Design a protein around this ligand. Structure first.
Ligand SMILES: Cc1noc2c1-c1sc(C)c(C)c1C(c1ccc(Cl)cc1)=N[C@H]2CC(N)=O
Ligand SMILES: Cc1noc2c1-c1sc(C)c(C)c1C(c1ccc(Cl)cc1)=N[C@H]2CC(N)=O
Lengths: 107, 108
């Protein structure tokens, strides 16, 4: 759709290159980061690399499905981390860009 | 008054305000009532649907993006403050899904 193409070429494009994007470009690697409780707490892992591949492979049926994956990714960050963690501020920053850009998504 | 703000008021707020899980979000978190002396230490920008609704009713917003940011802050506040296993987290996620579904169909 027009909408998915916008989420791909405008919204993801903008988030991907952001200085705070790097933790979100691939799945959380619980072994490398030493987080034995990550997959016990976060039951639906999501990252922008996954979303991006989904956009490329025509996985999504509707814009809202993709927006829901974006939302899951940010929500997982807030749920798992301490409120004072830098990553929380990084996610909030990225989430505000997402919504600002979503407001202009062609209908 | 914008077409988007009227959409957020008539479609988004309408749907969310009457939802069966909306009741925790209809007024600001009352830290005294709930026995939460750290609430305002952790959440620096409290937000609730009662405030957004009043803002929509009083033409406080200049752009729909601003109203959408308030909704977002309200949900984010919930995920940050609460433990992962808390029922309110699931209530918030339910409401936020409806939010995102509706904003996908907002004009322009
Ligand atoms: C996304 C996401 N959600 O949680 C986490 C992540 C990711 S992915 C990734 C490549 C890293 C370095 C993390 C960080 C993290 C830690 C410090 C800073 Cl500045 C930024 C991110 N934190 C973990 C949690 C933990 N305490 O290790
Ligand atoms: C919104 C928001 N963010 O956090 C909180 C809230 C609110 S507002 C409100 C009127 C209540 C009853 C809460 C609940 C809460 C607790 C149990 C259930 Cl079923 C539903 C909400 N939890 C507090 C946090 C806490 N531990 O009390």
């Amino acid at each position: 759709t027009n909408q998915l193409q916008y989420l791909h070429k405008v919204v993801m494009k903008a988030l991907w290159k952001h200085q705070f994007a790097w933790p979100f470009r691939q799945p959380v690697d619980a072994v490398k980061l030493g987080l034995p409780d990550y997959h016990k707490i976060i039951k639906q892992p999501m990252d922008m690399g996954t979303i991006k591949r989904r956009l490329e492979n025509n996985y999504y049926w509707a814009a809202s499905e993709c927006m829901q994956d974006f939302n899951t990714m940010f929500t997982n960050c807030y749920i798992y981390n301490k409120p004072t963690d830098d990553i929380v501020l990084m996610a909030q920053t990225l989430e505000k860009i997402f919504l600002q850009k979503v407001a202009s998504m062609p209908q």
